Amino acid sequence: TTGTATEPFHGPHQAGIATPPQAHAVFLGLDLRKGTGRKELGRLMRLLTDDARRLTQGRPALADPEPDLAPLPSRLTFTFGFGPGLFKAAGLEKQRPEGLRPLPPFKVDRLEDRWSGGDLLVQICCDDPITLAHALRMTVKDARAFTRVRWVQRGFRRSPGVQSSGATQRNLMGQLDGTVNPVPGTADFDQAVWVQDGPEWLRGGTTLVLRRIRMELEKWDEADPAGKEFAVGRRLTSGAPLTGRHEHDHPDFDAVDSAGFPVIAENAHIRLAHVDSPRLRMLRRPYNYDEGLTADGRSDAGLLFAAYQADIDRQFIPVQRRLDEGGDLLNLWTTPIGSAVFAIPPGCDENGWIGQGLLG
Amino acid sequence: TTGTATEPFHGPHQAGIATPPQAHAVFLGLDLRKGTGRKELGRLMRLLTDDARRLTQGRPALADPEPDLAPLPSRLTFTFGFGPGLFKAAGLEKQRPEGLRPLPPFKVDRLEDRWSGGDLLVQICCDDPITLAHALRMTVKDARAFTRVRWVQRGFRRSPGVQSSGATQRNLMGQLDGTVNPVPGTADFDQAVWVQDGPEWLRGGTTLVLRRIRMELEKWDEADPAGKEFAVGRRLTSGAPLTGRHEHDHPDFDAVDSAGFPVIAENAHIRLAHVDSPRLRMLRRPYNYDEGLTADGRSDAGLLFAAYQADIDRQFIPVQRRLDEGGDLLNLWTTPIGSAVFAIPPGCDENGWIGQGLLG
Numbered sequence A, B: 001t002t003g004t005a006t007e008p009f010h011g012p013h014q015a016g017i018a019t020p021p022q023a024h025a026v027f028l029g030l031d032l033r034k035g036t037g038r039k040e041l042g043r044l045m046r047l048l049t050d051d052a053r054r055l056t057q058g059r060p061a062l063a064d065p066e067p068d069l070a071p072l073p074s075r076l077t078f079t080f081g082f083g084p085g086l087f088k089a090a091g092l093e094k095q096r097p098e099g100l101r102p103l104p105p106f107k108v109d110r111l112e113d114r115w116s117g118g119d120l121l122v123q124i125c126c127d128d129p130i131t132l133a134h135a136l137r138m139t140v141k142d143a144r145a146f147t148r149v150r151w152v153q154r155g156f157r158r159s160p161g162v163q164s165s166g167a168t169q170r171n172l173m174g175q176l177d178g179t180v181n182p183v184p185g186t187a188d189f190d191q192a193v194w195v196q197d198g199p200e201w202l203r204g205g206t207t208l209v210l211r212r213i214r215m216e217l218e219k220w221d222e223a224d225p226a227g228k229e230f231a232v233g234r235r236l237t238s239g240a241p242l243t244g245r246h247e248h249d250h251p252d253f254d255a256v257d258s259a260g261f262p263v264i265a266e267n268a269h270i271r272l273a274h275v276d277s278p279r280l281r282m283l284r285r286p287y288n289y290d291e292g293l294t295a296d297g298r299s300d301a302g303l304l305f306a307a308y309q310a311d312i313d314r315q316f317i318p319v320q321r322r323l324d325e326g327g328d329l330l331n332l333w334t335t336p337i338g339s340a341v342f343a344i345p346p347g348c349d350e351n352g353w354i355g356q357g358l359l360g
């Protein structure tokens, strides 16, 4: 059995980023109440740090409402993030990274306030949904005095054991999703993900762009399979680039067909999203969402697109701009409906707390 | 693996009842459209039967819009049920069992139309939520011409492999839930679950009472642990009756405390819910639900209470009435907000389809 497995809470980095993605996630987006300043934020982060320290190791939180749901942590992780409004409330604008601001508008955006922004992120990931539901309840119990819930975004991947660790998993459009990514345990990952410049408190942390992206599955069902593959640049079943044979063949962006047109389209998703330098790649760690049906049978499903990077301006915005300005073929069937940005602090040890280097 | 494992679709009984409950479930409640009569119902059930026959074994459905999501069936099962309103639409009123009718009102009820009733049930269970999401889309694709979606209720238990097979699992109140239950593959299970009297088409089937029961978790948090255990009649951690030591000890309903009062309260849940005859028990096969938060951090969570029994009038109603008239202490923290009843036909083989004995 696997319920006893844990991920370390303490370390130079917060868990939940380099951690291989678990089967379930909740992204809890919180707005600070009017009276919540620097002193209140310290009290809150000390509470939440201790909750995570205990629950991730299968021990009840202090004042745990349901202590029997703490054992069997199933690789529970907490990742805390600070939005732009957190720095304002704390009086710490000078410590806010220049790039930590709401993203610029893109033509494809259909953003909704109810899925956007947020002052404080609690990202909770777990291989088990009961453990996760309990961790969320404890988080809200300790946060409620200081914050209001702005949004809660629940997502899933494959259940534990359904696919081998490291095997690429499919999204709700049926596509293999996650082939090209920095790999933990390599110097390129550390360069791409962990902050080294800017405000000193953030060194060893990262940044997160969280975009709720709706999938237009009724339109997708009506699309021709050859057109679906051409829009991405990869085949559906194998995941191989259209220029290759296996999933991990490198896409050949110079290849042309017998008539001279690019094999991978000028506006194919993977062409527009690609960056040459491995050190500038974003870490994509997405979850799928599926929520409810209209009376005439239309789905409400999509992707919780979570991208982690050391620098939003250098590693996220240029890619998103190329997708938008290049007219990504995938935009015919996907629509951004929420967007939020967070600075993710470095990790802590025992006797410390998440955010201590900024708020303490 | 957890992903390649299957459950047989064919047999004397439909799967998903005696099948040990998988990690995820969706209960899809459908209403028949105006033009959907007996002829349209037969066509619909033949379509859904063939979809299930294929998808449960990891093969794409006919005209599958995302066939790459069919492999890794992860113990997918489908269970189809017919509500009271289906029989009038088929012109088969005299084939409706006497006991197939909405439950009578109970004082604790706060039922909502959006969680209640329904002409046709598709219960889809699976160890994997991506497989389940795809199965749901395939079901809706084939049913939407003949029906409208009345509700969709998603629930979860532990992820696969978190606990050993057969071990009792906890609900969102932290309670072990499922201790006293007919065991699949036993004579008592067959007597309690599978219909043997009444209209011939239903023999080998069962009936389902599906109740969405909200847990008042904020009030539950205000309760002391002694009161929580007293309200049920069992200890939280061990699951043992208050009169015993281990989970599977028989409760001693005659034992009294030092004050001469029953150890298991006169209005304790397990006393009011208990039936002496194993052949009259109901099979409880519940799922947990957790859906969204108010701005002030109030949860929307509870139990998808699914009870299967050969006779609702003899096996469900008397228990539910005793909980209501007896003033079950658990009623302080639980509220029924939806209720639906279905007749579940017997299984089929490779030559037939679900409901053929009624609709063919």
Ligand code: HEM
Residues within 6 Å of the ligand: A171, A173, A175, A176, A177, A178, A179, A180, A211, A213, A214, A215, A232, A234, A251, A269, A270, A271, A273, A274, A275, A282, A302, A303, A305, A316, A319, A320, A323, A334
């Ligand atoms: C619902 C929306 C989206 C879907 C369904 C989707 C799907 C995919 C697929 C199937 C691939 C190819 C396999 C892989 O390497 O993972 C891919 C690659 C990629 N996607 Fe997306 N994507 C979405 C949104 C986005 C967005 C908003 C970005 C913004 C930056 C993005 C960035 C990337 C990158 C950087 C790659 C790697 C391309 C390469 O270098 O080969 N994706 N995506």
Ligand code: HEM
Residues within 6 Å of the ligand: B171, B173, B175, B176, B177, B178, B179, B180, B181, B213, B232, B234, B269, B270, B273, B274, B275, B282, B303, B305, B316, B319, B320, B323, B334, B335
């Ligand atoms: C609504 C939320 C409910 C919760 C949280 C709940 C919880 C529990 C718990 C903790 C037990 C003891 C362990 C076990 O044997 O499973 C139990 C037993 C039982 N419950 Fe419930 N229950 C709920 C609703 C209901 C309802 C509506 C019924 C209606 C029939 C019911 C029928 C039973 C039965 C028959 C037993 C076995 C009693 C025995 O013979 O020992 N439960 N329940």
